[PDB]
Design a protein around this ligand. Structure first.
Ligand SMILES: Nc1ncnc2c1ncn2[C@@H]1O[C@H](COP(=O)(O)OP(=O)(O)OP(O)(O)=S)[C@@H](O)[C@H]1O
Ligand SMILES: [Zn+2]
Ligand SMILES: [Zn+2]
Lengths: 165, 292, 381
């Protein structure tokens, strides 16, 4: 990378470990929004209210045995919580793709300098890209491939075997 | 969004995908329907994948050339735009076609798991020869807006110049330390080094060109007497000059009636040998792509 | 069913015999190369033959896997052949029947009820992790003895039911089986040629993003069985780390740098040395210049520290025992003390077994059978 590309401390081409919060991936992080805001705390607390009842059976099933061989004890923690922060805020308030050649041509690389500006997928049976799947279904090569049965012969044998198992 | 080469309307990705789909999914019955020939369609030949088997036998024989009919591009629906892009911009669209032919040669043994090695195929430089590009309009009915377009011509060969070496790589040697460099040609211009490339030897004007170590390519000039289908009132026949390169050298003999498809080119000609002054009126010639 | 009912009726026109053979209820899962539906068993011998594969939940629903026609028939035959050869244990989900029409094929499997994984990891306890990892390692060592490499182990592929506490594996569609100096000048170790003529090695790159093994990242010609065990290690680290999409790769080299920022430039150069290729990184400012020499403890430590001190983490002490645990390692009621010593012991053990679960060299990396005989998994035996 040229130094002009990497100048930004926020967007970097290579991944950096900025961690983040709220179950998000550590490399992207939380650039779009912060969890320290009051409103975000309110929505997270509202989801937490829903999650208490769901988490109670989760704690109770595996408290002593991994298997179902079976009221709950929980470790106190010095570090802070979402509810204490909420309380503090209230106190403040109150595609497979096609394979391609390894090496490219010199004329092909020369054309990259001349370029300016002005559902979809790949079918391996016909080995072509399509704009839409429903248009690829109605095409002479796909329908000609469908009416032929000599290329599913192995399938056919397997079908027959799986019929009398 | 989508990128377009400046001066054209051509996208490398779009043309590559369209020509790849065309090569994977063409049948000669499409050419039968396009030419309004329904009663001549037969099951055993037309319904077979044309370019698939042609590329297969291209792999078995060691052939590195694909002869492409431009009318077949009009036969296929998705390449009807590409046909025009082949006629208007041969220089880059032909390169796109060569690159995707190489991709298809890789794909036919990657997907089907053949015993051929990939090294020999990816070492080879596959190139395409489009032909039957349209109506055979005359040389003298063409215009300066037709420069760098694909043109098809009738003719009789009158004579050909001997094999001419045109210089592709240049070999320069230092006089004092015998350090050499090789420089590639870039659009007809070779950059001779002012200073020696060595860190120890940096003597000025110490690099001399050794003409026999540098690599050359074949270039031949053929004088072709054109026989147009339509001749205007009182038009007297003329001779064109057509330049063939590399493999096409010495493929046309004097006195044969041939079908030349090539690129309409124009260059300025120097008025004097000693001076670099060029003439404002340009000299036209055909850069030959395919000979039938 | 706002719009999917037209897809059910469309599938009904797709196959003429499915009406007499099945009745289909809903759409359960959407994938990349298939879309699976839940259907009623109605009448059939397949339900009576297998029986035991269906759970104790009952009612005998049957999954119906519709495969897109874009997939190559060779991969389909490979997938169905691999499912039919294996059979045996319940975790592999053997197929009942196959229904084929002129272009499309239907795979019929017993339905295994479960819930989505985005609900597990945030609140699932360490004993649940023990059962989860135990089920995956039993199923993986089973498919190892059969000789099948899966290369597609993801949380969506694994099906787990909480109230019964068991698992099952699907998606063997990308699986397969395997059977087996100095020259002067041209110092290529400092730069690449402007025009490339040599080829790129044709790998078997087919995994999902963020789970692809580091051997797969470097395109090893002789590919082993041990992609799956590193992937189950990755799932283990995501469960312990409380972060779901922990590895996300824009491309391959992005994933190489993702491995670099945790393990270190030197560690991956030694891992690269055994594979025959050398990796150099110049510049590349980050936090830990040589990675973490201690291991994964301090990395997952400040990983939880950031999201804890921010304070968006949920209130459940199911994932607070790890913060206290890791805090006393980095710093350094009697029944409460019993719960202490038990959780402390096996929770140290899971990180301990995690470092051997994350070994770079496959030959040094122990097989799943050795993972079963570790002292960490004692109570399940
Ligand atoms: N028997 C089953 N019971 C319940 N859910 C299932 C079952 N089989 C598949 N699924 C669901 O289907 C999804 C997994 O489908 P996949 O097999 O991964 O599809 P796919 O991976 O896109 O196609 P492949 O890789 O070529 S098999 C998950 O959402 C699973 O929950
Ligand atoms: Zn198709
Ligand atoms: Zn010199």
């Amino acid at each position: 990378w040229k130094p002009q590309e990497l100048t930004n401390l926020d967007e970097l081409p290579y991944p950096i470990l900025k961690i983040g919060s709220f179950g998000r991936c550590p490399f992207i992080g939380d650039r779009n929004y912060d969890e320290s805001s009051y409103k975000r705390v309110v929505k997270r607390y509202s989801r937490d209210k829903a999650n208490k009842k769901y988490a109670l059976q989760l704690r109770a099933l595996f408290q002593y045995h991994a298997d179902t061989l079976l009221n709950l004890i929980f470790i106190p923690h010095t570090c802070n919580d979402s509810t204490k922060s909420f309380k503090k805020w209230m106190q403040e308030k109150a595609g497979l793709g096609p394979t391609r050649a390894s090496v490219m041509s010199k004329n092909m690389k020369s054309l990259s300098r001349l370029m300016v500006d002005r559902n979809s997928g790949y079918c391996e049976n016909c080995r072509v890209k399509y704009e839409s799947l429903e248009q690829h279904i109605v095409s002479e090569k796909h329908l000609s491939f469908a009416e032929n049965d000599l290329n599913f012969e192995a399938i056919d044998s397997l079908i027959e075997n799986l019929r009398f198992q | 969004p989508l990128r377009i080469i400046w001066g054209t309307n051509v996208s490398i990705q779009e043309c590559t995908t369209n020509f790849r789909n065309f090569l994977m999914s063409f049948k000669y019955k499409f050419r039968k329907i396009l030419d309004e020939r329904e009663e001549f369609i037969n099951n055993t030949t037309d319904e077979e994948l044309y370019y698939i088997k042609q590329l297969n036998e291209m792999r078995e024989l060691g052939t590195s050339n694909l002869n492409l009919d431009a009318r077949n591009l009009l036969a296929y629906k998705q390449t009807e735009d590409l046909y025009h892009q082949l006629l208007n911009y041969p220089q880059e669209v032909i390169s796109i076609m060569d690159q995707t032919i190489k991709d298809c040669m890789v794909s036919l043994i990657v997907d089907n798991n053949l015993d051929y090695d990939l090294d020999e195929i990816e070492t080879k430089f596959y190139k395409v020869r489009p032909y039957n590009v349209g109506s055979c309009k005359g040389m003298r009915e063409l215009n300066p807006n037709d420069i760098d377009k694909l043109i098809n011509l009738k003719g009789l060969v009158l004579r050909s110049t001997p094999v001419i070496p045109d210089m592709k790589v240049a070999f320069f040697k230092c006089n004092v330390c015998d350090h050499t460099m090789a420089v590639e040609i870039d659009r007809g211009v070779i950059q001779e080094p002012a200073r020696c490339e060595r860190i120890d030897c940096n003597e000025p004007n110490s690099m001399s060109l050794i003409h026999n170590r540098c690599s050359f390519a074949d270039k031949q000039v053929i004088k072709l007497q054109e026989t147009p289908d339509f001749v205007p009132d009182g038009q007297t026949p003329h001779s064109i000059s057509l330049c063939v390169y590399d493999e096409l050298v010495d493929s046309c003999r004097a006195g044969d009636r041939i079908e030349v498809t090539g690129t309409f080119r124009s260059i300025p000609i120097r008025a004097n040998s000693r001076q670099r002054v060029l003439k404002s009126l340009y000299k036209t010639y055909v850069d030959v792509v395919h000979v039938k | 069913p706002p719009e999917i009912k037209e897809e059910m009726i469309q599938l009904y026109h797709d196959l003429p015999g499915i009406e007499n053979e099945y009745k289909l209820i809903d759409k359960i899962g959407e994938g990349t190369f298939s879309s699976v539906y839940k259907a009623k068993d109605i009448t059939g011998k397949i339900t009576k033959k297998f029986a035991s594969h269906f759970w104790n939940y009952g009612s005998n629903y049957v999954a119906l896997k519709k495969i897109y026609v874009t997939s190559s028939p060779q991969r389909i035959y490979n997938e169905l052949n691999l499912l039919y050869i294996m059979t045996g244990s319940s975790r592999v989900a053997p197929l009942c029947d196959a229904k084929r029409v002129r272009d499309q094929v239907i795979a019929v499997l017993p339905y295994y009820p479960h819930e989505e994984f985005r609900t597990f990891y945030r609140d699932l306890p360490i004993k649940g992790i023990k059962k989860y990892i135990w089920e995956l390692l039993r199923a993986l060592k089973f498919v190892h003895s059969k000789g099948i490499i899966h290369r597609d182990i993801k949380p969506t592929n694994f099906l787990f039911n909480l109230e019964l506490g068991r698992g099952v594996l699907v998606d063997f569609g990308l699986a397969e089986a395997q059977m087996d100096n100095n020259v002067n000048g041209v110092d290529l170790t400092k730069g690449y040629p402007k025009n490339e003529t040599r080829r790129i090695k044709r790998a078997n790159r087919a995994g999902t993003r963020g789970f692809r093994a580091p051997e797969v990242l470097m395109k090893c010609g002789a590919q082993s069985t041990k992609i799956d065990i590193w992937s189950v290690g990755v799932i283990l680290l995501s469960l312990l780390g409380r972060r779901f999409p922990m590895f996300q790769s824009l491309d391959d080299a992005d994933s190489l740098l993702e491995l670099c920022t945790i393990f270190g430039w030197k560690e991956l150069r030694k891992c690269a040395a055994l594979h025959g290729l050398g990796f150099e990184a110049s510049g590349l400012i980050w936090d830990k210049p040589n990675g973490y020499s201690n291991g994964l403890k301090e990395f997952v430590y400040d990983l939880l520290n950031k999201e804890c001190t921010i304070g968006t983490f949920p209130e459940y002490s199911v994932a607070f025992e790890t913060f206290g645990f890791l805090q006393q390692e980095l710093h350094d009621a009697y029944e409460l003390k019993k719960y202490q010593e038990e959780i402390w012991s096996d929770h140290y053990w899971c990180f301990q077994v995690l470092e051997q679960c994350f070994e770079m060299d496959p030959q040094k990396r122990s097989s799943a059978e050795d993972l079963l005989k570790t002292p960490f998994f004692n109570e399940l035996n």
